[PDB]
Amino acid sequence: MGQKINPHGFRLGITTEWKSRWYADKQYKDYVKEDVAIRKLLATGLERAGIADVEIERTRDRVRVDIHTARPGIVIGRRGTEADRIRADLEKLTGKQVQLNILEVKNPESQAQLVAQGVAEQLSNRVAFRRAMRKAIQSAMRQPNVKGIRVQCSGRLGGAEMSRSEFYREGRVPLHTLRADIDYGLYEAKTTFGRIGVKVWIYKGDIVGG
Amino acid sequence: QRWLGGMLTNFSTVHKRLQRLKELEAMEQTGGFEGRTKKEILMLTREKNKLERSLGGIRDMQKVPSAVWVVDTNKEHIAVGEARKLGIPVIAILDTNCDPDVVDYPIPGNDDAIRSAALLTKVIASAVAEGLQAR
Amino acid sequence: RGRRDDRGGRGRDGGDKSNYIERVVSINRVSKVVKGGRRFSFTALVIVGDGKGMVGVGYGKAKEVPAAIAKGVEEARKNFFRVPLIGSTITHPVQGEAAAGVVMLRPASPGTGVIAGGAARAVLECAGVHDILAKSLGSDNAINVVHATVAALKLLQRPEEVAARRGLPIEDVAPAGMLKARRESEALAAAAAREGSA
């Protein structure tokens, strides 16, 4: 319908960096398999925690798993108790040893992934969806330094039978411009009536910064 | 040059064009011309060209005025209806084909002659300067 | 208009002066056919006013319901309208017409209550009246009966204004019962006002 390519996959050569970074000849399928099982292992407890980014640098078979989140304090509970448990399970599930770096984003409401987190987690929690979005925004519109936003919500909105898509915005979000620095995040709400897939575009600025 | 529809009733939008015109002239005293692409420089030459050639008085206004002086109530009908709508009194020149009920404090006369019209402009401009002297 | 009860840890709800009385009369989704389907928008007929007897009439167009209500609030805010009274009644029987809206607004003795249909009941409950007797003849609508009621309140005038138009010393303009009601209403204005000063 809207045949819109994932813009983090449309600027992954130009502005947005890769999330996983190594070099691999004849070891690549194994590094893919470990990358997948690591991201499944970091889905659940960190999606409780407020995860945004999961980068995996990979040096000579050590591993370096780095996570950008919005609360160092739920990811790091008691020191080593909440960190070294998921870290140690990453050390056992992989056949390797894990150096887990955990870091905070300076503003959670201007990460598109974290905006999709807070919006969809509100939308599972029986709030008004036009109020959620509309408050998804107002906040982020701001606050830093953030020249667009565009929120779309499809699915059983309000528990209705029809799957109505909604489309709210403010400012400038140019997708066809490649010097855009757009963050994109889709996260999917889980109501009892079903799943409300939320897409958030956030246009930070014109800046190439090449 | 041309009466833009909605200057008085809509001041909150046409004031933004003025601050953009200030940022344009303040980036003309800056001197950034060669560092940008010349299509953007000629485009800002069109923005300063049209926006300065068509907007000269509200450059000094800023302040949603208390009185409006109108030449030719017939042709500039938009200014007289907008000026009536806010409650601002209307001072005008009225030929034989102008409705005097829309103008509170008129000065009747021909507007087609540059001597007569321009002389009445001298009347009320000297009147405003006479207001400025004792203030 | 749902999910309004909320507590926010944000900057401000911006509650401030002019706590006026605001009534939303009707909302009908307004559709528009375009190429490939229908575009639903929303109209909210907003009545605002204070209990002195100043009335607004606003008409909100937006594709969200509280957005249309807020735009009707700002539009009636832009356009107020003074209604003359006697005590908390109306002066004299009028009929207003807004092109099909007929409304008869007749005064009554106090204590009777605002008897009117829901649009006229809205415009008169926001206003400074407490005891009048209206009826909405014709047009069976909300917009035309609100706008017809406001035209009916434009056909109102003071007893004093009438005396002034005719250059006659009051007494000589009213009859006497209504002058006595002026004495009653200004007397209770004096009692509640001087209880307001202390």
Added chain:
RNA sequence: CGGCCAACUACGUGCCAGCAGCCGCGGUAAUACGUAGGGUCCGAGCGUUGUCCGGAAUUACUGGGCGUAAAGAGCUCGUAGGUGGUUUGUCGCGUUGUUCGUGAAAACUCACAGCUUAACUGUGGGCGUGCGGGCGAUACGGGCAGACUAGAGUACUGCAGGGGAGACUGGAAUUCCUGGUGUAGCGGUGGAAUGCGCAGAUAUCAGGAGGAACACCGGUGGCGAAGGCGGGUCUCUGGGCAGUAACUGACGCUGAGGAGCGAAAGCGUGGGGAGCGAACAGGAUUAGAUACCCUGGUAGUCCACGCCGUAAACGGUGGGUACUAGGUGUGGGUUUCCUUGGGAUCCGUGCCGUAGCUAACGCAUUAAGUACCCCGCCUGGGGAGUACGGCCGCAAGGCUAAAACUCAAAGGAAUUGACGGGGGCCCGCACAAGCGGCGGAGCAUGUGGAUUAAUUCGAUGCAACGCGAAGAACCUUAC
């Protein structure tokens, strides 16, 4: 316990069983069906059905309407009726003031008393909106008796006009006829064919007959009450307008029923019959034309004498009257000024435009504006301007005019779209200009269908069918 309309959740059946006052709820996640919890509203009751008033300004006296929504008789003349300019007098019938009589009791309303309270009952007022008698008033309506000239009508001087009827006559054109000249086609169409020709057509020239219609002037123009009216001339006759004010002195307006006029088609009797032409043939088109298009063609169209009475008889706007900014055309006529030009005026007919009005479009001194007088007419859509009955008619039919029943609408104006074998302007291998193919042959793949124990499952206009498969011997793999 959807919405109105105070009051919601689960289970059970999933276009069934049922619900419902209307809108409408039931197609395996119903707050609308059935049961449960729970809530709401009433309470010795609470729901249903029926009948009436209300809401219904929806028969509108108070208190509605008629350009297009239902609704202005086709148009006039006029009987009863309704309505009436200016002014003096008189009567006191309408109107009004006041007093008397009466409007039984009960009820109703106000106060009070009585029953433990209340309903209930009683006492005393008011109500009894009216009617009759006496006395008073005279502005307004009316009656009578008068007076007036602005409305109305008449006389006089002009003026414009397809107003009407009768009579006589004019030319161009079409058709036929006789006679020339003269040959093989003419006619007709989107393209053709029936058709007329080769026996002398069409073509052209001369003459003759006969009928009808009036080119140009001639149009947003004139006249008529409305239909309607244009070759000319003559005869008879109708209305209008202006000017003077000579006369009469309110004689005005409207008008239920009523009489008269009333396009076209049609009808009767008698004429006439060129062109056009229903019906009626043939031809063609087409699936099929009982149609459009073609060739022929009778009633009719024409005149005389009568019928009939209908129309988008339309300005979709009843008639009269007074008033309410203007601007510009054109038709008829009077006058002041420049000296035909301009002004002013009375009557007419158009275009634009304020105020005001209207649902909107629009109207807007030629009102759909502001008011008065009289008439017609409307009361949801169908059923139906139909039946029954009567009246008129030679007939066709017209006029007058229902009910059962049924529907939850049928309508008016404007808005956004889509659409058009509407208009304009544009583009694309869209056509044209080319080149190479597919459709026929053999095979390779995929699908339909039929098979099968199984032929796993998906994808069927463009946008499914060398597609999910970037690899079916076993594995894959679902059968």
Added chain:
RNA sequence: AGCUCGUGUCGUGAGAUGUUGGGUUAAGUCCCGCAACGAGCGCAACCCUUGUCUCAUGUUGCCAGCACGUUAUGGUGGGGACUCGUGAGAGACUGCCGGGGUCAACUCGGAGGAAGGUGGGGAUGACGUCAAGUCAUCAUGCCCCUUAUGUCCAGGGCUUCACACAUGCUACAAUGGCCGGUACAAAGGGCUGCGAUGCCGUGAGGUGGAGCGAAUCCUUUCAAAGCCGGUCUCAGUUCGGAUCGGGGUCUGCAACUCGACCCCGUGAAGUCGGAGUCGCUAGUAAUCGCAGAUCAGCAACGCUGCGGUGAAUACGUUCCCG
């Protein structure tokens, strides 16, 4: 090439206006007007590749000027000159001149230049449509199975066939077939992989392992159509290869149902294809080979790419289609 919004105005209202008008554009591109003034998502631009040059640049790549090879060639000492490889940079902007333009946008010609006017091609799909597709990629609400609708294995099927459609490939021959000689690519692929010289076969291939995780080694120094020569003489043929028989090789536990390839024979339809219909406007069409992914093997004539040789025509919007 459009789709909207904010604020103002217009309207009782749905709504309008803006976004219509005059001109211009590949384009709501852009100017000039106009009760509108602005913004936003699109269009354009930013990015990749192709076209020219400059600077940097020397092995595994080039070889001019040098030296040495003799057999076989940059083969080897050597060299930055030419390529080429990949980094940075310049360069196309109606910038420069002539004419139309309302002295505005823009359009017709000229110069310079490798390139001229979005140079060529990509990547890039606005608001929405179609209850389009997919509960079999995955995720999933609800309903169903739980002694089977789970799961394990052998065998079979997904390949059946009187048919009908659809996309392709090989053809119907002389611009051709067959034999001999000979010249020129681009890109790619490679670990329990790619596998050379040599030897055994007619040939698939066998034996063997040089050498390479690869600008080096291997895919032969890479092609085929091309060119030179000979033969065939218009024919159901020296065209055409379907089919069928015999004989093999390789992969795999296993080629029966059901693999590909080679050898010998066999030698059918088919003589340019009815109505209809499809693709394509320049390195395009047409034709010629090459590589890749999937893969032990292959139904590959498929798909994705790479290069070779290379045309005709466009008068122009009447007609069909959007």
